[PDB]
From a paper:
The Na+ occupies the same site as Fe1 in the di-Fe center of the Dps-c-Fe and Dps-o-Fe structures, which is coordinated by the same three ligands. In comparison, Fe2 is coordinated by only two protein-provided ligands, H49 and E68. Consequently, we hypothesized that the “Fe1-site” might have a higher propensity to bind metal ions and therefore contribute to stabilizing the subunit dimer and possibly the dodecameric structure. To test this idea, we crystallized Pa Dps from a solution containing 0.5 mM MnCl2 (Dps-c-Mn). The Dps-c-Mn structure is nearly identical to the Dps-c-Fe structure (RMSD = 0.40 Å, 1834 residues). Inspection of the ferroxidase center ligands shows an Mn atom coordinated by H37, D64, and E68, occupying the same site as Fe1 in the Dps-c-Fe and Dps-o-Fe structures and Na in the Dps-o structure. These findings support the idea that the “Fe-1” site exhibits a higher propensity to coordinate metal ions than Fe2.
Residue numbers in the entry:
A (entry chain H), B (entry chain B), I (entry chain G): 1 to 156
C (entry chain L), D (entry chain E), E (entry chain D), F (entry chain F), G (entry chain A), H (entry chain I), ...: 1 to 155
The structure:
Amino acid sequence: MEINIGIGEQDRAAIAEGLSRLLADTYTLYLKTHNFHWNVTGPMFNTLHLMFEGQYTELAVAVDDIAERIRALGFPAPGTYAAYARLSSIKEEEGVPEAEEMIRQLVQGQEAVVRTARSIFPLLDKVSDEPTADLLTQRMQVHEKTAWMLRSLLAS
Amino acid sequence: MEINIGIGEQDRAAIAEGLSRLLADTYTLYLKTHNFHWNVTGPMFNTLHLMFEGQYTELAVAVDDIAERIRALGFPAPGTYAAYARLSSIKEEEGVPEAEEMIRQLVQGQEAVVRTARSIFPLLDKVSDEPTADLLTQRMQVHEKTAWMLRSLLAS
Amino acid sequence: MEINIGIGEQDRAAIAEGLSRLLADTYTLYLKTHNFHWNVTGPMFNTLHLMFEGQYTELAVAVDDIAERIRALGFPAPGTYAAYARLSSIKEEEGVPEAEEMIRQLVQGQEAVVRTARSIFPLLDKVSDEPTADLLTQRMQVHEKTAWMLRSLLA
Amino acid sequence: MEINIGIGEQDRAAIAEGLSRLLADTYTLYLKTHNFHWNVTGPMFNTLHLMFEGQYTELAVAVDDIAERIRALGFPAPGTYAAYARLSSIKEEEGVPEAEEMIRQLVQGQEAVVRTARSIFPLLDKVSDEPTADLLTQRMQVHEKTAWMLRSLLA
Amino acid sequence: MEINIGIGEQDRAAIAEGLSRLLADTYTLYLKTHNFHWNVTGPMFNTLHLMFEGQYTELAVAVDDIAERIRALGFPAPGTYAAYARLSSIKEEEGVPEAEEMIRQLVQGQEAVVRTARSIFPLLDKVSDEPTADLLTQRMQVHEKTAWMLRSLLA
Amino acid sequence: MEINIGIGEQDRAAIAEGLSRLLADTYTLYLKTHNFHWNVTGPMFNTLHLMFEGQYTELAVAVDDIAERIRALGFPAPGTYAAYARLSSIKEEEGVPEAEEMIRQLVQGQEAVVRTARSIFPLLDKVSDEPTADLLTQRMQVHEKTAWMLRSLLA
Amino acid sequence: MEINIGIGEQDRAAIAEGLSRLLADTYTLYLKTHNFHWNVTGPMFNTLHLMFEGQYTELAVAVDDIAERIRALGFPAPGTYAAYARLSSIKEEEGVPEAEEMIRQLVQGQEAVVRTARSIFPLLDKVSDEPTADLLTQRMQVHEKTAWMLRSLLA
Amino acid sequence: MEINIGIGEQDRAAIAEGLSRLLADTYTLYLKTHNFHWNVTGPMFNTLHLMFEGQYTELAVAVDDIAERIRALGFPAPGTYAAYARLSSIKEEEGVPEAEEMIRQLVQGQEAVVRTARSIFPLLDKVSDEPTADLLTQRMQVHEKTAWMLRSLLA
Amino acid sequence: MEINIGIGEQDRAAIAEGLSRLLADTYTLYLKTHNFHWNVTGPMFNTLHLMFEGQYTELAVAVDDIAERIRALGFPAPGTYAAYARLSSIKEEEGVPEAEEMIRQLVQGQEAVVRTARSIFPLLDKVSDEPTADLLTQRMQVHEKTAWMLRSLLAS
Amino acid sequence: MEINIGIGEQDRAAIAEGLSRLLADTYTLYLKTHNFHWNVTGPMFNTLHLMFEGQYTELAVAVDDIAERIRALGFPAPGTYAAYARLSSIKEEEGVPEAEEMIRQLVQGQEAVVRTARSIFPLLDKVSDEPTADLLTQRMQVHEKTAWMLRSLLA
Amino acid sequence: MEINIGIGEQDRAAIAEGLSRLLADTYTLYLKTHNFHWNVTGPMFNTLHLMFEGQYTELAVAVDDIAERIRALGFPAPGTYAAYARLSSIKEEEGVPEAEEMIRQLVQGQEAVVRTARSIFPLLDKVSDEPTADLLTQRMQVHEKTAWMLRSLLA
Amino acid sequence: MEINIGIGEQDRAAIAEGLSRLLADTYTLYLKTHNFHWNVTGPMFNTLHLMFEGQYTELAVAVDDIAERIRALGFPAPGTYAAYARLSSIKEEEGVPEAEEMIRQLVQGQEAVVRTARSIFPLLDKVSDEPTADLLTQRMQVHEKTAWMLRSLLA
Ligand SMILES: [Mn+2]
Ligand SMILES: [Mn+2]
Ligand SMILES: [Mn+2]
Ligand SMILES: [Mn+2]
Ligand SMILES: [Mn+2]
Ligand SMILES: [Mn+2]
Ligand SMILES: [Mn+2]
Ligand SMILES: [Mn+2]
Ligand SMILES: [Mn+2]
Ligand SMILES: [Mn+2]
Ligand SMILES: [Mn+2]
Ligand SMILES: [Mn+2]
């Protein structure tokens, strides 16, 4: 059945392309957070195990909301290692860094996602897509909050 | 007691007029969806009965939220058959269509509400009512997501 | 599939027609109650706002149970403004009455549903349909209780 | 301790006999519904696996409610394969029907129990046993609704 | 405001009177079960302390439902020691019986409520007060069930 | 088994006697509150019906707790219309006052229970019984709270 | 679709056959427990009525789990009076035994399931069906624990 | 660690300054609402006690949400009587006014927070901070809705 | 309508006055703890953010309980910045201290409330206002427990 | 950091010593209640297994609250076999008594702990330690109630 | 701190290696299931969207359990696209297959995890790592059960 | 009543001996963890007070499960300081060590329970006591997981 939601097909394709990078970034940050949840050690173990658990649990929900916005725009949601490797601007950590470096990478991850969200608004303006803009706004809120909580641990 | 929320009375009345049409369209969709929930048959009965139940439940809450924004703006919320028939842009189904045609009508219903929501933004531009804009954006989000779920059923 | 529940076709039809009137009254009362829930003002705002909330919430469940009794009997459940306007015995209010007039209208609404339910028992006796008689009994219980709470506000 | 609930011992024995057949039909339908839940296949697996689970779960409670009404009347509740095979009017399915034949057998199961329940209201009439009449009424409402949901799948 | 629930004023007055006696017997049984919950002793303490708890908990709700049916009919609900002793047909226990005698009195108490309930159905036949008839049926069902559970301890 | 809790038989018996007046006042206030819940009318119906419900709900748990302190002290908990009408200092109301008068009686009822609890303290300040002292404290806290909420309605 | 879970058709068939006996014993025990739950009398009514409720509630879940393991192995799950009566090793009880004999039979029921469970293990080692082995293990744990709680009543 | 969220430091300081006045007005209204909750009296006591309780509970969460947006922007959240008295645009009530005047001041208070929220938007246009805009929008929605509920009490 | 709860006006007023001071210390500690919850940083961010959250949540309920005892005694409960500044004995912190100083101040705050509570008892002994006595006793138990948990963090 | 709760070190060390015996009694009773829960047999198995479970569950919480009041006072909490063995006035039971004797020993235990509670109140008076006085008062309330329920089994 | 759990470093490392492949397969099945949840269309949208939701939700918990078992063995858990792609035996789908093909791949994906689980058991036998054995057993049980439900949709 | 679960009395007694040791190690760890929960200090207070709370809460449930496995085997469960101190292989700590030494001891407690569980397995091979093997497996899984979390804190 044809889609008549007030946005033409190529404009929807462009928004979906942006949301696909956002999904890729969000999912890469999900897996990294999950990874650090399992692997962190040192005297901060209990606090960071729990903190990273709260984060990966939140991100798992965010990946589902982003992917379904893509579907609501009429396009397939990417969901493979190859697609996420290709589309993600966040780099993965292949080793087991010290707790402090883990916190530092996650701060940078939050901020990388904010960057990707900001990059999509020029498009939404010209095309007019308030739901997508509200989605990006919610992700920016969560990641900026999460970044304050993470960097606060590094404060002198 | 005089209302001092930063919007003049005739501008509030224009917004309320717009939200009254959105409320009638949402209410008409609610009862149609409820109707189809009762009356659908065929091998998709269990899945459509449940699916339309989720939708009518969500719309029941949406009708209350839209009505209460009208009240927040200092105007009465319409709430009769005659007001909704007059204000709605969606047509009712008096008979019992096939399940496929139920699904198609509900897809068109989602899209009709999105169009009514959009028609209110030019007003909100000129006037400046962020809460109402957030409400329209939420309804657009729900209806565009529901449209994807409904139209997926028809894919061949 | 054939319907073999011990009630014949014309009989089920006549019961369904009675329940359609009850559904139409119940649904009209639901919307009137929803409407007064939004629009009531005055010093009783908070209690009436909340009380009309409990009522429309209960009525929304009752509409689903009446509708689905109609379906168990083998007939489509009506569900449009036109069908309810034709079938319904409750006069609609297009303005915003004072709080005490809203209460009276709702009392009269409760009693209209009861009057419609009572209107169906003569048929049910003849026909024998204990589930529908029990549905009508449950609705009469609710509407009579709700009528006492409403009219109590007017004393 | 003697039982003085306003119904004599042989009248209670007779109500217990009717309830014992109702219990055997309800229990046979419970096990068949449980069987079909486990064994149904095809594209309707997810929807029927779930639907038959709602039904068999509802029926486990019904068996306990019927059986304890028999106890309330002063009589033992039957509860063996042999007892239920003897009292049941519902035929058993020893194989694995296609999904549609499962839906159809279960519609007829619903209508069988309603038949058994209807057969009992004469007696309860004569001896004015209002609890047992309410129990039969609730079982009929359930099975008639279920039969509509089942048969809707075959339309 | 006028009461127009389809039952004239004199008929409601008489049903209200029946229910007032049902309420007094239910409340009296309520306070006796409560009394025995506190006061039972012996090797059955745990079983009966808990069993009598479930019973008074249930009856507390029963008294509220009965009283509000009276209110729905347009009449004040009695609720003093003096009204209940006058209206009650159950006699209270001023002492502290042995466990077995507590059980026997509670059994008898269940059957006394069932009796007061049956006393009422005649007033309902004339006017088809189905809500009240369902209320009585539910109380009869609860007390007949509880009688079985209590009397079972004496076998 | 002998009760060895560091309070002597006569002293316990004197506490039981005081707690028994507390129970009688609490139970009499419970039933008065219940009564007024059912019977209040007027524009404040919703607020008072709900307010009195919360009050009566809380006292029912309190009667159980007062009564079980008496049993902990080795004595029977009173539980009859006669025994409460004797011990209670709450004048019962046999008719249906105006809502404002219901509120006043209920205020006085809170104060009555506190007056009784206070009367029991001399006895406690000669015997060492911290649990009974804490129970009296909890009741006074609740009834003084309740009295403020009640009297506020009258300002 | 072919089944490739690492066990070949014949072995899956042999394991499903043992699980079918386990299902039958478990289901028969379920019904006998359900039966004794309804039918026990005497001083221990309250305690055995609840104890047998807990057990049959657990066994109803167990029948589902065993049946679905049979489906996971690729075979249909038996589910008729005739099929359980043939496969079961538990003797049914058509009467109403005394409370202690009900306990005694339910003890022996637990031990017959264990016996059946143990008979299946030789087969599983051969093919290393670990999920089936864990299933048997959990049922044995539950039945051994229930046995202890039941026989404790007879010490 | 450097803050790289796409907003410069002085731009963040200006947003934080605006949000610090939003926080001060929100906290001042929280406390005023809490105060009126404790202190209101008259026949509306029950409904305003509860309504003001809904409001202060919601505002308590709002104060935490606003303060943590400030922290997300990299600045300290104000949290003293002196800081809030300096930054607040809302005056406190030091006495105990009549219920109507309490309602009037809470209306004025809702509308004061809306004006403060509105005042911050020009900054967010120029700078680009969508999260803060969404926070402002949610506060505006809550206070405008609450203003309707409150002022409806005065119609 | 009169108040006859076995205590006279002049005595209730004296108790209300002492509970007014308790309310003011409890609120000032409430606000201080909330402040530290938002504002604490360092490697202990997570544990202290969470710990101060539990405390400010508890204290919010205590202020409601103290305030309504005053009301039960027949007097208006104070609730303004100025009323609490005047009546309170806790020193407010206008800055953002290091985490260890935040802990130390919150210990002192616990003890300050206890000190205020002890000072009221004499006045209850005369008239046997047992409810107020039990209220004080409960606050003392919470604050002394909270003080132990706080000071255990400083131990070396 | 220094402790300044209005109670000097010597007085706090004396209270700790008392609470340390109360804790060793409470714990010893906790393990003994726990032990009898596992090991009781006979026809009261179900009722006592469940009664002892409720009791030990309660005692496990009480041990934590006693230990942590000892930390609030500024002293370590004992927590080993040797410490509890040294401090406990509760005699341990190394075999498996019969149910009646288990009931007896647990009644003794409730009363032993009440006795230790009482022994500490003089200190608390001297120094005014109201929190610890309320802890003891709560233990005594629970143990005196529990003893009533246990000894009731022996009547 | 040294790891002394009865298994040496080299053996723990070999098991960790095996569990790393189990993690990779399980995470790959996780993401594919998640993908088919978003992307499936056609008449089965509603049932498959929900079924795949239940599956991916269960696998999210499973990956956490397998990861933490590797950590309990003393080794890092892998957690990157490259590491999972290297270790996984499941082939990713880069397109959007038809619903039936999605079902078919999810069946094979269930069977591939079982295949990997089986391959690990020898290394466990030679050292008596019973917790890892039980983890593998639980995964096989979930996956064989899920394969039955999936393949049933294709009959 | 004889015990017939497939294991001889000599064998069941030997298994109950192994589990008595396990029960003793588990209770000893339980109390030590509970002790450290109360007594730990320093900058890790909040994290370790919480972590040790979760651990003792879990071990308290574990002791009940191990005790009741012994009762399922037909032997009494030990439960006194002297029985546990005799059987326990875990050396207690009578002082208050530094937080890090508390962690290290709790690591060794975990591994000591694992050591005792492993000693028991042979005796279960000879006999096929599957429930007991699974209980040990579960305990091993919990302790080896808790060990990783605890030793992680020391990295
Ligand atoms: Mn989803
Ligand atoms: Mn609403
Ligand atoms: Mn429905
Ligand atoms: Mn039952
Ligand atoms: Mn009521
Ligand atoms: Mn009780
Ligand atoms: Mn199932
Ligand atoms: Mn916060
Ligand atoms: Mn409050
Ligand atoms: Mn603790
Ligand atoms: Mn985890
Ligand atoms: Mn246990």
